[PDB]
Amino acid sequence: QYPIINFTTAGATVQSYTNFIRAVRGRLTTGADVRHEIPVLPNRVGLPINQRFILVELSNHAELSVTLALDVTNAYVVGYRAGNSAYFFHPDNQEDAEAITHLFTDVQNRYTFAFGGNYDRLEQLAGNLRENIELGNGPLEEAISALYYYSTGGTQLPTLARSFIICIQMISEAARFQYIEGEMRTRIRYNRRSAPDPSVITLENSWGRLSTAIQESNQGAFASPIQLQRRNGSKFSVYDVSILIPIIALMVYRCAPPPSSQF
Numbered sequence: 001q002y003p004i005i006n007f008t009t010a011g012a013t014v015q016s017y018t019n020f021i022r023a024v025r026g027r028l029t030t031g032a033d034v035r036h037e038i039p040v041l042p043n044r045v046g047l048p049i050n051q052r053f054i055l056v057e058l059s060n061h062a063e064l065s066v067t068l069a070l071d072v073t074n075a076y077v078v079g080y081r082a083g084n085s086a087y088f089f090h091p092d093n094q095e096d097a098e099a100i101t102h103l104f105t106d107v108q109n110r111y112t113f114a115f116g117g118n119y120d121r122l123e124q125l126a127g128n129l130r131e132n133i134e135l136g137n138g139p140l141e142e143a144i145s146a147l148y149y150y151s152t153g154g155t156q157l158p159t160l161a162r163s164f165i166i167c168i169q170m171i172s173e174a175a176r177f178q179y180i181e182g183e184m185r186t187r188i189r190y191n192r193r194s195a196p197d198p199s200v201i202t203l204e205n206s207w208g209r210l211s212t213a214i215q216e217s218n219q220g221a222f223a224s225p226i227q228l229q230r231r232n233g234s235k236f237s238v239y240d241v242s243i244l245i246p247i248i249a250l251m252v253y254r255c256a257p258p259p260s261s262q263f
């Protein structure tokens with residue numbers, strides 16, 4: 001019974017996309033854990049299998065549909081279903097391998113890719129880095145068709161990998177970061193695709209570090225500042241959770257919240 005959120009690229013607007021992302025964050029977080037105003041994803045440790053995934057059903061103007069499975073612990077796209085086939089990225093560990101057996105349980109054809117689903121591996125397969133892959137509603141429309149045609153040989157591996165790269169950033173990264181959701185809003189509003197700039201790429205690559213820096217901070221102050229990049233590629237130093245409240249929407253669980261040492 002995993003929850004399903006629907007989005008279509010057909011006639012998508014800033015509003016329909018914002019409703020989608022808000023719904024996905026609503027199914028990822030439980031309200032149990034908020035630190036400095038920033039929600040934390042459920043802890044993997046002890047999380048029951050019936051609560052472990054959400055499903056995102058994507059449809060497009062071509063009238064096709066694919067369903068992505070996201071792990072609630074990290075918002076990671078672990079696989080997808082297109083009609084009678086499902087495809088999963090190579091799991092990180094035995095427990096995740098058992099977990100994905102609980103997805104798409106009726107599907108006639110189940111495959112586990114031999115490669116993992118991280119950006120570095122997908123960029124190698126795609127023959128292109130994130131910085132050279134355009135995002136927006138047109139890329140997402142195209143990516144939905146490409147995932148849908150995989151099983152029949154119509155979609156080549158490099159184009160499947162590029163299509164995952166588009167879906168992950170427009171769904172998981174946008175759920176993780178209001179900043180990235182706003183970057184996608186822009187592209188959808190003007191119907192103008194464009195590759196992510198260094199502000200988007202540095203936020204993506206730093207999500208885990210920022211999650212840990214916030215959770216281990218002293219009252220919000222980082223022991224070690226983290227360097228991000230602005231749009232023009234110039235350095236932006238982060239010393240404190242405060243400047244990230246408009247930027248990061250949710251964190252991956254990294255440590256227990258200390259007992260509130262209150263004055």
Ligand SMILES: Nc1nc(=O)c2ncc(C(=O)NCC(=O)N[C@@H](Cc3ccccc3)C(=O)O)nc2[nH]1
Nearest residue numbers: 074075076077117118119120168172204205207208
């Ligand atoms: N399939 C898939 N779904 C994702 O949501 C996703 N999200 C992110 C990445 C990716 O490599 N990120 C680059 C990176 O530097 N990630 C950090 C931060 C992080 C991101 C996502 C999940 C956990 C940690 C890390 O691997 O340590 N790849 C993913 N692939």
